[PDB]
Amino acid sequence: WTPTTEQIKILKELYYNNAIRSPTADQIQKITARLRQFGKIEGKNVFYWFQNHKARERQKKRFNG
């Protein structure tokens, strides 16, 4: 799975406007339903997108990050 550009923009809006980091399972279902209007996507793709960003935040907080 690779998000479409529009899906990425929506995911970043949720991440930076709502400050979502670890959505509930109900949130993942609702987010997936909206993202599906812009292309293929499954709920686990949303779960892992937020998980991958947690790892990226940890990298940005290291000395050489």
Side-chain angles (χ1 to χ4, degrees), residues 20-35:
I20 293 161
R21 304 292 173 250
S22 190
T24 70
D26 288 337
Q27 286 182 301
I28 287 163
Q29 184 178 36
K30 291 180 188 172
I31 293 168
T32 302
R34 175 63 174 140
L35 296 171

Side-chain angles (χ1 to χ4, degrees), residues 42-60:
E42 299 174 344
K44 82 180 188 188
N45 300 143
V46 174
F47 171 72
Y48 288 120
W49 190 90
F50 285 93
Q51 290 294 103
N52 292 333
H53 271 284
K54 281 182 176 151
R56 173 70 184 143
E57 298 295 326
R58 292 197 75 89
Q59 304 164 6
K60 299 164 79 65

Side-chain angles (χ1 to χ4, degrees), residues 8-21 49-50 53 56-57 60:
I8 294 167
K9 288 206 316 202
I10 292 175
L11 284 163
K12 295 204 175 198
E13 172 188 3
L14 292 162
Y15 191 71
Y16 294 118
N17 286 8
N18 298 84
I20 293 161
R21 304 292 173 250
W49 190 90
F50 285 93
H53 271 284
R56 173 70 184 143
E57 298 295 326
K60 299 164 79 65

